[PDB]
Each structure stands twice: as C-alpha cells, then as structure tokens.
C-alpha cells in the first residue's frame, strides 16, 4: 500500500514503483480517501514476494 499523488493515474503508480523499487506489478487498485488522498494497493507479481520488498523499503 502507498499514498500517492492525487493526480497519479495507475500507469503512473505502476511505472513509479518499477523505477523506485526494481519490481513488477500484477495489479494496481486505487482509492481516494475521505480525507482526500489517493491510495494505491500495488499487488506484486508472484516472483517479487512483498516481504523481501517491504524490509528493503524500510518498513517492517
């Protein structure tokens, strides 16, 4: 999960996390929160397991 820019259209978020984190994406879903911030549930592929990617990001 990320919080993204309010004007990022899901081909941004798919292309953002490729450039930043050297991964590939299965699917992106997208929300706009009731405080007004766009979420993006970035489901990775089956190869890039998200725990090896989460602690390299910095989160647990």
């Amino acid at each position: 999960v990320f919080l993204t820019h309010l004007r990022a259209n899901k081909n941004h978020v798919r292309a953002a996390v490729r450039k930043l984190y050297d991964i590939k994406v299965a699917k992106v879903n997208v929300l706009i929160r009731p405080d007004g911030q766009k979420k993006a549930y970035v489901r990775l592929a089956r190869d890039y397991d998200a725990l090896d990617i989460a602690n390299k990001i910095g989160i647990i």
Binding site: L20, I57, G58, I59, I60
Partner: protein, 123 residues
Amino acid sequence: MVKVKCSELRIKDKKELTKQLDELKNELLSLRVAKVTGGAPSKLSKIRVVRKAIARVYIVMHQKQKENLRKVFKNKKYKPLDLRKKKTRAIRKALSPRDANRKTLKEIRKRSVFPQRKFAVKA
C-alpha cells in the same frame, strides 16, 4: 554535511546538477518512509534540510538554462514572451519613446531658427 550553496552549485556541470538532484530526491524519499514508520531519532529533521536543498539545485539549474536562452535570443528580433521585459501592460504598449518624441519636419524647422533667448531685465 555542508549546506549546499548556490554559490558552489553554480560552478558544477549540467550532469552533476541533475546527478545531485536525484540523490537528494532519494534521501527525501527515504526520510518520507521514516516519518511514518517511527523514525527512531527524535527527528531525522533532514526533511526540511533536504526539502530546501533540492529547491536550490532546481533554482540553479533553472537559471543556468534561462540565462542560456537569453544568450541565444540575443541578436534575434522576436524573442520569446518570457525573455521579454514584463514591465506593465500599459507601459509595454504606450509608444516606445524612440517615436513618442520624434517630430515632424515642420517642427524641427521651427526649432532651429528662434531659440529661447537668455536675458535679464532691469535698468
């Protein structure tokens, strides 16, 4: 570190300005991660320190490139509207003084035969 100075940023190249731009971008991305994951120092307050550090690499890159366009749009009439003297709208239109005070040949000929003489009166 050293506070990144615009004075010392200006002596760099085009490559080193945008290669210093991404690595300060990458710090702010990592400090953005660490703000909400419970950054263990009482603050890694390099948020504002690198937030304004990239503003100046931007400022220096942007005025190293507008000062270069002003070097190319020397000698050309019809320079861009941004490399062209926004004074006020009223001042830009109002007869550029090189012909606001040009004169008819009839008035240049009344000008050169009776100058205001310079005199004094009393007995």
